[PDB]
Design a protein around this ligand. Structure first.
Ligand SMILES: N#Cc1c(N)n[nH]c1N1CCCC1
Ligand SMILES: N#Cc1c(N)n[nH]c1N1CCCC1
Length: 330
């Protein structure tokens, strides 16, 4: 089998992407944030504290003839950025772009933190990292990909995120029309539960490529590109007037600037992020200070190849026995 679904930016800055997902019988369609940096499929629901719902579409398991309470199971997730959610668990039928999994764990939120409440466009998360990070207790549950994998034509999914435009998540096949040149594959460590790999270096603008190993994670659920402070300083040094602002929370730059591109290495290959992709707009409405899309990972403990990086590529998440990651230009 295969599946193919369109993923759409939630706003004009590509802060996140939402993908429609069918849950239950009859189908309840929710728009979920596909997240290769976490491993829980959780949703706003009829069980979510009323004051914590503000415009989201909710899953109502009592209206699904295929929903079953997973007795005794609870879940609780605290994301690196301080957001959180928790609740109980149903199994139900979940379909993405025509690919159906029966008995998928659908984690129903009883509580969500304010950042989730405030984003009316995101109805939940669909985790695509390794199932070892799944938070359901006392019996850990599998991700949608892990459940689907054996049935797929090939044990892979691909992320093709758009810049200020829709893109695609495919399951089970590689669309050879969706990229240019060749796909370069690179090793993955699953030791921390992530799609963790090592970039071979970087360049700023038309500058020389610096060969240096940068370990990090391919994380569709993170907006920005978080890299070591040395690398990030070298980038922003090429933008007149750029500075790191503790009050704003990272590097900002004059909105009148033209940003240089940023290149990252994948083996001997190179992925070029255009300068425009690194512009996250005014820090507040009407400001002439703009927020940068490349930021230091120093306070995080891991480098993160988030949407800013991934949207410059066609990315293959190869879930074979020894997983790998592939990147192509597009
Ligand atoms: N922090 C964090 C994070 C990450 N590294 N990947 N996806 C994250 N999400 C937080 C909000 C929903 C998804
Ligand atoms: N201002 C500023 C600043 C800072 N506090 N740390 N790094 C900075 N930059 C790196 C090159 C551009 C400015």
């Amino acid at each position: 089998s295969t599946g193919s679904a369109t993923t759409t930016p939630i706003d004009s800055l590509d802060d996140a992407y939402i993908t429609p997902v069918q849950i239950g019988t009859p189908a309840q369609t929710l728009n979920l944030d596909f997240d290769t940096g976490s491993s829980d499929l959780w949703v706003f629901s009829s069980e979510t504290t009323a004051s914590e719902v503000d415009g989201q579409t909710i899953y109502t398991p009592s209206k699904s003839t295929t929903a079953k309470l997973l007795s005794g199971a609870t879940w609780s997730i605290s994301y690196g950025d301080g957001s959180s959610s928790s609740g109980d668990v149903y199994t139900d039928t979940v379909s993405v772009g025509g690919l159906t999994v029966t008995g998928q764990a659908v984690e129903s939120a009883k509580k969500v933190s304010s950042s989730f409440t405030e984003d009316s466009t995101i109805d939940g998360l669909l985790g695509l990292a390794f199932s070892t990070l799944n938070t359901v207790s006392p019996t850990q549950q599998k991700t949608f990909f892990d459940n689907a994998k054996a049935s797929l034509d090939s044990p892979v999914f691909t992320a093709d995120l758009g810049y200020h435009a829709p893109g695609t998540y495919n399951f089970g096949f590689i669309d050879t029309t969706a990229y240019t040149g060749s796909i370069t594959y690179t090793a993955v460590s699953t030791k921390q539960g992530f799609w963790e790999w090592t970039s071979t270096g970087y360049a700023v603008g038309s500058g020389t490529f610096k060969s240096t190993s940068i370990d990090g994670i391919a994380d569709t659920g993170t907006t920005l590109l978080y890299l070591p402070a040395t690398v990030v300083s070298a980038y922003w040094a090429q933008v007149s007037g750029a500075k790191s602002s503790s009050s704003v929370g990272g590097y900002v730059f004059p909105c009148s600037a033209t940003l240089p591109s940023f290149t990252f290495g994948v083996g001997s290959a190179r992925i070029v992020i255009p300068g425009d992709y690194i512009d996250f707009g005014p820090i507040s409405t009407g400001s002439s200070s703009c927020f940068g899309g490349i930021q230091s990972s120093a306070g995080i403990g891991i480098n993160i190849f988030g949407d800013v990086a991934l949207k410059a590529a066609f990315v293959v998440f190869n879930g074979a026995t020894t997983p790998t990651l592939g990147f192509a230009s597009k």
